[PDB]
């Protein structure tokens, strides 16, 4: 047989990228995919030669950022690109979950495949609040204060486990010492959770724009996917690109420019653009452990899709409530990122509160309650007696 | 190697899916066709009509969602202008 | 929130760098670092910018040699452990006014004026904003709006209760060059200064930009057509279905 | 790209690597020239150098 | 999920209701017409998802030309929507062949299914 | 139908002559796609590797 | 079929550790790759936790981790496990090595998996390069110094290449920061490569004492050899913690406990022991380039072994001749490690350059003169004629 197949590690190589067999019909919304396994490799290549100029030392931190924009040799290049990577990788994991919701991608038989990719989603929101934190700018040490003491919540044990992970009475040396070790390492952590996120894919293939078997007609990964693939990544890059050159301080916070002040939170302090909806969620909750609560379980309730869609059919290609109401959930989620950009003010707090219950209504009734009523229609449309 | 749980998916010359018999294709060599010139009349028709199917599904919820937004957030200018003062403090507490 | 607590938003000015293919105007910049130093160094630091990146920039290397010499820095201690001073060199950072924060605080009854090497990316509005306060004092606070004894009315700051007051009045600096001194020259001026500080990378961003931007785009469409040629055969291929005659 | 242009340099072969690598070594000079020039000559009057000139009293 | 006993029980029901039916059945039409999987040569049982033992049942028993026939049917579907195309108005399946010929093979093996879970988990009652 | 007879492929098919028109394009938009993508390499490469050089701040000789 | 076959993720933890069926007859000298295993763990772990508390600056290093040895809680034990973890990772992978030269276990079918091992030597080699540079204490910073100048041998672009390294003009700042930053980068790219050294293993399997086949009497890796492995983990961990409680410093330099001088060697410098007897190879050489060209050569020639063995049986259990040399290979490569620690004066010179001699001579002359007559040994000892 050839060498790519015989040999021990070219036939994974080939299994993976060159004969896996892919669906015919698979769209561009498929393309994301390979679009993240290139963020994440933008994000570690960018961030460990950084890493070379970086000083984690609270006192330092801010200046060795300065540093490596003004004093290293491309070094704003490598700064934008992996500041302004981060929010691409979000942006591209938001429309690979969206695909995924799109076309029942999270049924079985690909059950594993998504529960991996919620985890993986946890890990890329946790790396990216820690590398956010390293700036040491204001909104690094007062989003470090806020969401460490989210596990303050936790009841009893809550106090301690917060002066654990500070290293001291309130975040100091010892916390972005540590946040910067921790940063470097999730992002490792992650690649192997991309890996078993493939073995899980790779048993099953991928599913199709029509919901129905792949398995009559099959073409292979390369030429056609590698080609179709590369189209993407140079749209991917000539966008960031634009961003990086001519507007790369758009997506972040000015407060962010300025070094970190224990004594004073700036009235305009926002959110990284990306944790909006889940702020406003937690934002909706008059209670301190509710709200935690609540924010947390709007990413778990991700898991419970494969078990509240109850059609008997793959994806809302041919489903028209379906259709419409996944759009209200993708506006809907938009609308808590802009509330979340929002001061707590009549009235928005009412539309947050609003929003919040329509997203949580999606997974736990809207979904389980239509998919019942479509089953149902596409029986009397056509049977009779 | 040790023996692994089957799936639905195979490999080429074992795909999983039904006998096929009666299908015939037919292709034509990308070297032997016209140089993608074939791309507007033959697309640009096409485009747009796709959308024309989808656009509703779309637009409607968008647009329920702007007008909801638009609304808070004059509602939200005039609570915190002079002239809204009053309804302010009502609402507020 | 109110229009007061927001602050009046700062209108758009039509700076020469502004636009993908556009440079700072390096005459502008150097007439600013003259403002910076007569009037604004006075209170506020530039801690993160060093002599020698004025050079090619804005100043020759000998014209920056002799601004560095005219500050001391401690030098090394000498054989006898004594501490001695040196003149500035091209490796030293622009000083301060202030030797502490108590001491800067002190000498602006509580307040701190910020270090100014970051500003123009540390506010909302950028240089419009910058340029806008400078230039946006009014000879007296808007009626009913009572000021804290110390303070000065902005609209363009939040709050409108600002700790610095008006500094730029027509003719106060001579410039080198002819230019007229009015306040909103020197506003002009000191604005651009300031944003080259904050963004020292910019002149050449841009211009690696456009030959990113020019690669990046042919390549896309490049992909394209070379992924339709390699879909050819696929995309245009044909099934027909004769029904197999029934036995087995 | 014209057939007949393309087969006097190529006869119906792709470029080869070899090829393709020295033609990005001369695409690199040429283009970076190329740009710079454009570049300076868009933003005359504003640069260093222009102002530099300028300041001859 | 839902087990097509159920969709059936639920369906018949309002198909046997002179009421229900009146006001029911038209939206299904129009539902199953803006669906637009006739406009792919699909027929609505080639729509269910298969990965499933009951389905696997279910196809295993299709008769041999009907088989030979969905595949078709999918192949066809696949093509055309790689293309970005409907196929022309005359290849569109039209109602009266919009058939359930999948549906009682489906039912039986569910049926066979459910009576086997419940001999499974059998009481006695001395 | 007999599958002797081969479905109608004329609106794709080159009429004219010349059977390398489609070769020719092909080839150069491949070429200049490689050609162009070597070049973004080199300069990415070369990108990280000079932010291992010296920086403006040690290149200070006393 | 069982859950552990079944399952995606299990199977392949099955298939390695559990039902992997190993010759009944392996010995103890095969427990060494799991124990390496252990070491790339420890180091890891240990690596990471220290991490939290230390500072890249060349200002900060030392003291930062004088503050590990004083301030942080347990901090010296993570330190002193992570130094003495290191010797201890190299004392296993050299009998692990050896293991392979006495068993013959790089002849076919298994040259890949050995090749992946040679790599996985010069990774680890220069990982504990990397690491030893970051306590910046005098051996530190002359062993930076040193090392990185091995390429300024390379013609042209030698000192070019040198002057990147250091990201100055002297091993400064630059230096000790980038190599902090690639410290943590390397174990995880080692890991990946023991990944593909498992993967070249497990298709042909692990060879055996007596160098046959292992085909007709395989047991299963779980219980037989998951308990037998316990016994090597536990006296590891047994040893180690002895010099880790009772001897920390006596695999080290006391000279490291004195903070860089970058205008003071010391008299008193010697490499780190397991890389004397490469660093006695290198002083053997009267000129710079092939002084450096023959180190190099010293672990490249590990490669030469499967094309040198003649032999037409693998291993040396029942090879006199063989084991002999083996044996004189050994000591001699104990003795080159003594001889760098010695100072460079006679006779310890001509007893260096003869020594290096018989290393090299060994692979090239030794193995295949010897393996070659014990082939016609063999024959002419039983048949007639
Ligand atoms: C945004 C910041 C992150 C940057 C990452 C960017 C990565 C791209 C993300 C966009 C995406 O995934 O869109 C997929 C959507 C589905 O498309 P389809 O599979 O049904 O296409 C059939 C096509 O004609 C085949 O056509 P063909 O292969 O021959 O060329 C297709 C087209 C592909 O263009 C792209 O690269 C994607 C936009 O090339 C062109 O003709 C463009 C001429 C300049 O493409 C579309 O048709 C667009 C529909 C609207 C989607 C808007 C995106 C929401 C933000
Ligand atoms: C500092 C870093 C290292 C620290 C961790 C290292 C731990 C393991 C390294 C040693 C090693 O691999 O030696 C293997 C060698 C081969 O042995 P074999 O397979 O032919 O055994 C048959 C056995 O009786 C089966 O016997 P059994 O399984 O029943 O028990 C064996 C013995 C095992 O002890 C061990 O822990 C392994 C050494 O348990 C005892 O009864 C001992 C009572 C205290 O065992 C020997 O005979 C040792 C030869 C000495 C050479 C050592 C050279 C090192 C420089
Ligand atoms: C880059 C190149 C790297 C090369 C590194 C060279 C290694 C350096 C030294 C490593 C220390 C351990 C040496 C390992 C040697 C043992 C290897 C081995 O596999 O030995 C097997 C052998 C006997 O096995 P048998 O199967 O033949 O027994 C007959 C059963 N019927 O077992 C025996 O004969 C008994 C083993 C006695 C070991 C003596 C070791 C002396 C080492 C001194 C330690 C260093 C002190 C500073
Ligand atoms: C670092 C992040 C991730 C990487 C690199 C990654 C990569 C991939 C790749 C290469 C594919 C196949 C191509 C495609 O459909 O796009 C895939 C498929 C899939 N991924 Fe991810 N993924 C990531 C995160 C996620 C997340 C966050 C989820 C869900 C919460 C997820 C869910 C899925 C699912 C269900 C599919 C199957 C799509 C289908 O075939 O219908 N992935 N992923
Ligand atoms: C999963 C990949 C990663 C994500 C999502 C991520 C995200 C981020 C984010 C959001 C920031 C703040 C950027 C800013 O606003 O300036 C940041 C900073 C940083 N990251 Fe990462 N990062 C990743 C991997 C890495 C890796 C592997 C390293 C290795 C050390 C690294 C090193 C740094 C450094 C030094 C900074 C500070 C400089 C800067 O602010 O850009 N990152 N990262
Ligand atoms: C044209 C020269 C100057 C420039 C460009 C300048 C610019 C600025 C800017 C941009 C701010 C920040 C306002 C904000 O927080 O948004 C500021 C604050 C301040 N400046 Fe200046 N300044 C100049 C001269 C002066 C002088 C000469 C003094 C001292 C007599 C002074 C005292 C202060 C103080 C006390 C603040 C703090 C205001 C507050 O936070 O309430 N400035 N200045
Ligand atoms: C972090 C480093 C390493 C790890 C974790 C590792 C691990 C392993 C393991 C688990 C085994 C199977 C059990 C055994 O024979 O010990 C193995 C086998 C082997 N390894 Fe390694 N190894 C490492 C480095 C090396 C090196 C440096 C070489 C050689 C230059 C090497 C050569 C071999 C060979 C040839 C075998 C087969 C032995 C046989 O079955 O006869 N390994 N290794
Ligand atoms: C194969 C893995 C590793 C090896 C062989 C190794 C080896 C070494 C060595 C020999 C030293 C000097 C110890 C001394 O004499 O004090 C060192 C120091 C250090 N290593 Fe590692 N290391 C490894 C992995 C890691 C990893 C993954 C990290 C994570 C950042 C790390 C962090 C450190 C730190 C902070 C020090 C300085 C404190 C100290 O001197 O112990 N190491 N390492
Ligand atoms: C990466 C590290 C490499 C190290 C490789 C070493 C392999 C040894 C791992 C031990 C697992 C034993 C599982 C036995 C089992 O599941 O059998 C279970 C029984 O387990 C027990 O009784 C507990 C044994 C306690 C062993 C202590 C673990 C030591 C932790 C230190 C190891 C650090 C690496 C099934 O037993 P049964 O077969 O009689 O029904
Ligand atoms: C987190 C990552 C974990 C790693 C997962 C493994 C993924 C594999 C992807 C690697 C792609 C690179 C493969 C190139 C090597 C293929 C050639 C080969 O194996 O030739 C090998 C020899 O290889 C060597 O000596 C060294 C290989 C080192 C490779 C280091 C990158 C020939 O092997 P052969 O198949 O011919 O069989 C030998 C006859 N008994
Ligand atoms: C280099 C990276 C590492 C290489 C990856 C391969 C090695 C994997 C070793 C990890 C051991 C951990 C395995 C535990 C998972 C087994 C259970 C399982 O897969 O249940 C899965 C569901 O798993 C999940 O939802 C999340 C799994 C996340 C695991 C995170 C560590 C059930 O899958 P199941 O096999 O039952 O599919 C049905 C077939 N009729
Ligand atoms: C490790 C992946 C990093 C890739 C980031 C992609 C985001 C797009 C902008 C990247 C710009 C960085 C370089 C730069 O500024 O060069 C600019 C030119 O950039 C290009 O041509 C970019 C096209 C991208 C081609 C990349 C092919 C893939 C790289 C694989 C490397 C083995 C300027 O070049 P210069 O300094 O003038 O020589
Ligand atoms: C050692 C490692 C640790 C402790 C990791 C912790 C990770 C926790 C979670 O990730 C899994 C967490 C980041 C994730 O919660 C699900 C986000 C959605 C949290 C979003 C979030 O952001 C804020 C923020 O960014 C701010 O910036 C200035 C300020 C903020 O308030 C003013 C917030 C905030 O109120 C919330 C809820
Ligand atoms: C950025 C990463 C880089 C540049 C990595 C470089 C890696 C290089 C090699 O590893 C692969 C190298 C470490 C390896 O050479 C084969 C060793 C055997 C080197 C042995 C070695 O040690 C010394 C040492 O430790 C010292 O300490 C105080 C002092 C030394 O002289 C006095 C030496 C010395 O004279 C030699 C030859
Ligand atoms: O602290 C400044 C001090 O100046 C006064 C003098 O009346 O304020 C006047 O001048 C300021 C300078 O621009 C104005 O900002 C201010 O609005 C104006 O009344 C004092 O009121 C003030 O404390």
Same mark, same amino acid.
């Given at each position: 047989?050839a060498?790519?197949?015989?040999?021990?590690?070219?036939?994974?190589?080939?299994?993976?990228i060159?004969?896996?067999?892919?669906?015919?019909?698979?769209?561009?919304?498929?393309?994301?995919?390979?679009?993240?396994?290139?963020?994440?490799?933008?994000?570690?290549?960018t +961030?460990?030669?950084?890493?070379?100029?970086?000083?984690?030392?609270?006192e330092?931190?801010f200046?060795?950022?300065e540093?490596?924009?003004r004093?290293?040799?491309?070094?704003?290049?490598?700064?934008?690109?992996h500041?302004n990577?981060?929010?691409?990788?979000?942006?591209?994991?938001?429309?690979?979950?969206?695909?995924?919701?799109?076309?029942?991608?999270?049924?079985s038989?690909?059950?594993?495949?998504?529960?991996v990719?919620?985890?993986?989603?946890?890990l890329? @929101?946790?790396?990216?609040? #820690?590398?956010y934190?390293?700036?040491?700018?204001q909104?690094?040490?007062?989003?470090?204060?806020?969401?460490?003491?989210?596990?303050?919540?936790i009841?009893?044990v809550?106090?301690?486990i917060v002066?654990?992970?500070?290293?001291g009475?309130?975040?100091?040396?010892?916390?972005?010492?540590?946040?910067?070790?921790?940063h470097?390492?999730?992002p490792?952590?992650?690649?192997?959770?991309?890996?078993?996120?493939?073995?899980?894919?790779? @048993?099953?293939?991928?599913?199709?724009?029509?919901?129905?078997?792949?398995?009559?007609?099959?073409?292979?990964?390369?030429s056609?996917?590698?080609?179709?693939d590369?189209?993407?990544?140079?749209?991917?890059?000539?966008?960031?690109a634009?961003?990086?050159?001519?507007?790369?301080?758009?997506?972040?916070?000015?407060?962010?420019?300025?070094?970190?002040?224990?004594?004073?939170?700036?009235?305009?302090?926002?959110?990284?653009?990306?944790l909006?909806?889940?702020?406003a969620?937690?934002?909706?909750?008059?209670?301190?452990?509710?709200?935690?609560?609540?924010?947390?379980?709007?990413?778990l309730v991700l898991?419970?899709?494969?078990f509240?869609?109850?059609?008997?059919?793959?994806?809302?290609?041919?489903?028209?409530?379906?259709?419409?109401?996944?759009?209200?959930?993708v506006?809907?989620?938009?609308?808590?990122?802009?509330?979340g950009?929002?001061?707590?003010?009549?009235?928005?707090?009412?539309?947050?509160?609003?929003?919040?219950?329509?997203y949580?209504?999606?997974?736990?009734?809207?979904?389980?309650?239509?998919?019942?009523?479509?089953?149902?229609?596409?029986?009397?449309?056509?049977?009779?007696? | 190697?040790?023996?692994s749980?089957?799936?639905?998916m195979?490999?080429?010359?074992?795909?999983?899916?039904?006998?096929? =018999?009666?299908?015939?294709?037919?292709?034509?060599?990308?070297?032997?066709? =016209?140089?993608?010139?074939?791309?507007?009349?033959?697309?640009?028709?096409?485009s747009?009509?796709?959308?024309?199917?989808?656009? #509703?599904?779309?637009?409607?919820?968008?647009?329920?969602?702007?007008?909801?937004?638009?609304?808070?957030?004059?509602?939200?200018?005039?609570?915190?202008?002079?002239?809204?003062?009053?309804?302010?403090?009502?609402?507020?507490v | 929130?109110?229009? /007061?607590?927001?602050?009046?938003?700062?209108?758009?000015?039509?700076?020469?760098?502004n636009?993908?293919?556009?440079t700072?105007?390096?005459?502008?910049?150097?007439?600013?670092?003259?403002?910076?130093?007569?009037? %604004?160094?006075?209170?506020?630091?530039?801690?993160?910018?060093?002599?020698?990146?004025?050079?090619?920039?804005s100043?020759?290397?000998?014209?920056?040699?002799?601004?560095?010499e005219?500050?001391?820095?401690?030098?090394?201690? *000498?054989?006898?452990?004594?501490?001695?001073?040196?003149?500035?060199?091209?490796?030293?950072?622009?000083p301060?006014?202030?030797?502490?924060?108590? /001491?800067?605080?002190?000498?602006?009854?509580?307040?701190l004026?910020?270090?100014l090497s970051?500003?123009?990316?540390?506010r909302?509005?950028? %240089?419009?904003?910058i340029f806008?306060?400078?230039?946006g004092?009014?000879?007296?606070?808007?009626?009913?709006?009572?000021?804290?004894?110390?303070?000065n009315?902005?609209?363009?700051?939040?709050?409108?209760?600002?700790?610095?007051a008006?500094?730029?009045?027509?003719?106060?600096?001579?410039?080198?060059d002819?230019?007229?001194?009015?306040?909103?020259?020197?506003? &002009?001026?000191?604005?651009?200064?300031?944003?080259? %500080?904050?963004?020292?990378?910019?002149?050449?961003?841009?211009?690696?930009?456009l &030959?990113?931007?020019?690669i990046?785009?042919?390549?896309?469409?490049?992909?394209?057509?070379?992924?339709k040629?390699?879909?050819?055969?696929? &995309?245009?291929?044909?099934?027909?279905?004769?029904?197999?005659?029934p036995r =087995? | 790209?014209?057939?007949?242009?393309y &087969?006097?340099?190529? =006869?119906?072969?792709?470029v080869?690597? +070899?090829?393709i690598?020295?033609?990005?070594?001369?695409?690199?000079?040429?283009?970076?020239?190329?740009?710079?020039?454009?570049?300076?000559?868009?933003?005359?009057?504003?640069?260093?150098?222009?102002?530099?000139?300028?300041?001859?009293? | 999920?839902?087990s097509?006993?159920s969709?059936?029980? @639920?369906?018949?029901?309002?198909?046997?209701?002179?009421?229900?039916?009146?006001? %029911?059945?038209?939206?299904?039409?129009?539902?199953?017409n803006?669906?637009?999987?006739?406009k792919?040569?699909?027929?609505?049982?080639?729509?269910?998802?298969?990965?499933?033992?009951?389905?696997?049942?279910?196809l295993?028993?299709?008769?041999? *030309?009907?088989?030979?026939?969905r595949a078709?049917?999918?192949?066809?579907?696949?093509?055309?929507?790689?293309?970005?195309?409907?196929?022309?108005?005359?290849?569109?399946?039209?109602?009266?062949?919009?058939?359930?010929?999948?549906?009682?093979?489906?039912?039986?093996a569910?049926?066979?299914?459910?009576?086997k879970?419940?001999?499974?988990?059998?009481?006695?009652?001395? | 139908?007999?599958?002797?007879?081969?479905?109608?492929? *004329?609106?794709?098919?080159?009429?004219?002559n010349?059977? *390398?028109?489609?070769?020719?394009?092909?080839?150069?938009?491949?070429?200049?796609?490689?050609?162009?993508?070597?070049?973004?390499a080199?300069?990415?490469?070369?990108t990280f590797?000079?932010?291992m050089?010296?920086?403006?701040?040690?290149?200070?000789?006393?």
């Amino acid at each position: 047989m050839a060498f790519r197949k015989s040999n021990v590690y070219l036939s994974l190589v080939n299994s993976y990228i060159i004969d896996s067999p892919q669906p015919s019909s698979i769209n561009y919304w498929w393309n994301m995919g390979s679009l993240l396994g290139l963020c994440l490799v933008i994000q570690i290549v960018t +961030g460990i030669f950084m890493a070379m100029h970086y000083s984690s030392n609270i006192e330092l931190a801010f200046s060795s950022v300065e540093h490596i924009m003004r004093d290293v040799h491309n070094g704003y290049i490598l700064r934008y690109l992996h500041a302004n990577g981060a929010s691409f990788f979000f942006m591209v994991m938001f429309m690979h979950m969206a695909k995924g919701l799109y076309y029942g991608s999270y049924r079985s038989p690909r059950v594993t495949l998504w529960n991996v990719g919620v985890i993986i989603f946890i890990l890329t @929101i946790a790396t990216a609040f #820690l590398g956010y934190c390293c700036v040491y700018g204001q909104m690094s040490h007062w989003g470090a204060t806020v969401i460490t003491n989210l596990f303050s919540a936790i009841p009893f044990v809550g106090n301690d486990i917060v002066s654990w992970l500070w290293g001291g009475f309130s975040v100091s040396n010892p916390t972005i010492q540590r946040f910067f070790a921790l940063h470097y390492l999730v992002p490792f952590i992650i690649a192997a959770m991309v890996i078993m996120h493939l073995m899980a894919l790779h @048993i099953h293939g991928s599913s199709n724009p029509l919901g129905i078997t792949g398995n009559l007609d099959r073409i292979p990964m390369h030429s056609y996917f590698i080609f179709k693939d590369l189209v993407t990544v140079f749209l991917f890059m000539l966008i960031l690109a634009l961003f990086v050159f001519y507007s790369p301080n758009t997506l972040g916070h000015p407060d962010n420019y300025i070094p970190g002040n224990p004594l004073v939170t700036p009235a305009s302090i926002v959110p990284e653009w990306y944790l909006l909806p889940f702020y406003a969620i937690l934002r909706s909750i008059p209670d301190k452990l509710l709200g935690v609560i609540t924010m947390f379980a709007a990413i778990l309730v991700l898991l419970v899709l494969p078990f509240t869609d109850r059609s008997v059919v793959r994806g809302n290609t041919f489903k028209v409530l379906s259709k419409f109401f996944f759009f209200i959930f993708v506006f809907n989620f938009v609308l808590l990122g802009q509330i979340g950009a929002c001061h707590v003010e009549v009235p928005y707090v009412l539309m947050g509160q609003i929003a919040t219950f329509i997203y949580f209504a999606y997974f736990l009734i809207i979904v389980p309650v239509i998919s019942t009523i479509e089953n149902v229609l596409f029986y009397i449309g056509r049977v009779n007696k | 190697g040790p023996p692994s749980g089957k799936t639905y998916m195979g490999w080429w010359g074992h795909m999983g899916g039904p006998k096929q =018999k009666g299908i015939t294709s037919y292709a034509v060599s990308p070297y032997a066709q =016209k140089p993608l010139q074939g791309i507007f009349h033959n697309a640009v028709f096409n485009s747009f009509r796709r959308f024309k199917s989808q656009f #509703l599904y779309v637009l409607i919820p968008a647009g329920i969602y702007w007008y909801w937004w638009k609304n808070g957030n004059e509602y939200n200018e005039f609570l915190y202008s002079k002239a809204g003062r009053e309804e302010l403090e009502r609402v507020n507490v | 929130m109110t229009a /007061a607590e927001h602050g009046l938003h700062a209108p758009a000015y039509a700076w020469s760098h502004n636009g993908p293919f556009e440079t700072f105007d390096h005459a502008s910049i150097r007439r600013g670092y003259q403002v910076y130093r007569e009037v %604004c160094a006075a209170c506020h630091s530039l801690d993160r910018v060093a002599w020698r990146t004025l050079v090619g920039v804005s100043h020759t290397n000998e014209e920056v040699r002799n601004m560095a010499e005219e500050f001391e820095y401690d030098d090394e201690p *000498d054989e006898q452990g004594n501490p001695k001073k040196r003149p500035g060199k091209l490796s030293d950072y622009i000083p301060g006014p202030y030797p502490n924060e108590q /001491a800067a605080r002190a000498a602006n009854q509580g307040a701190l004026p910020p270090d100014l090497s970051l500003i123009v990316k540390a506010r909302h509005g950028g %240089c419009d904003y910058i340029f806008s306060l400078l230039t946006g004092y009014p000879d007296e606070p808007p009626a009913g709006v009572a000021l804290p004894p110390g303070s000065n009315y902005n609209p363009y700051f939040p709050g409108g209760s600002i700790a610095m007051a008006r500094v730029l009045f027509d003719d106060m600096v001579e410039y080198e060059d002819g230019t007229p001194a009015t306040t909103s020259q020197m506003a &002009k001026d000191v604005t651009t200064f300031l944003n080259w %500080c904050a963004e020292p990378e910019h002149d050449e961003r841009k211009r690696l930009g456009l &030959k990113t931007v020019i690669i990046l785009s042919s390549l896309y469409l490049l992909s394209i057509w070379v992924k339709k040629f390699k879909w050819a055969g696929i &995309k245009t291929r044909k099934f027909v279905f004769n029904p197999p005659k029934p036995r =087995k | 790209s014209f057939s007949s242009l393309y &087969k006097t340099f190529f =006869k119906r072969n792709a470029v080869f690597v +070899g090829t393709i690598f020295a033609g990005a070594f001369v695409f690199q000079t040429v283009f970076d020239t190329a740009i710079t020039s454009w570049y300076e000559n868009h933003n005359k009057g504003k640069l260093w150098k222009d102002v530099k000139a300028r300041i001859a009293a | 999920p839902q087990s097509f006993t159920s969709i059936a029980r @639920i369906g018949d029901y309002i198909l046997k209701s002179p009421v229900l039916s009146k006001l %029911c059945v038209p939206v299904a039409n129009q539902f199953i017409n803006l669906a637009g999987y006739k406009k792919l040569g699909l027929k609505f049982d080639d729509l269910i998802a298969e990965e499933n033992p009951i389905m696997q049942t279910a196809l295993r028993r299709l008769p041999e *030309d009907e088989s030979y026939a969905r595949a078709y049917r999918i192949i066809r579907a696949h093509q055309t929507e790689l293309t970005h195309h409907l196929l022309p108005r005359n290849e569109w399946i039209k109602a009266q062949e919009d058939v359930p010929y999948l549906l009682p093979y489906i039912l039986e093996a569910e049926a066979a299914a459910k009576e086997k879970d419940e001999l499974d988990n059998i009481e006695v009652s001395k | 139908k007999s599958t002797y007879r081969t479905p109608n492929f *004329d609106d794709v098919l080159k009429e004219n002559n010349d059977a *390398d028109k489609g070769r020719s394009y092909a080839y150069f938009m491949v070429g200049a796609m490689g050609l162009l993508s070597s070049a973004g390499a080199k300069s990415t490469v070369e990108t990280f590797i000079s932010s291992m050089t010296a920086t403006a701040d040690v290149l200070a000789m006393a």
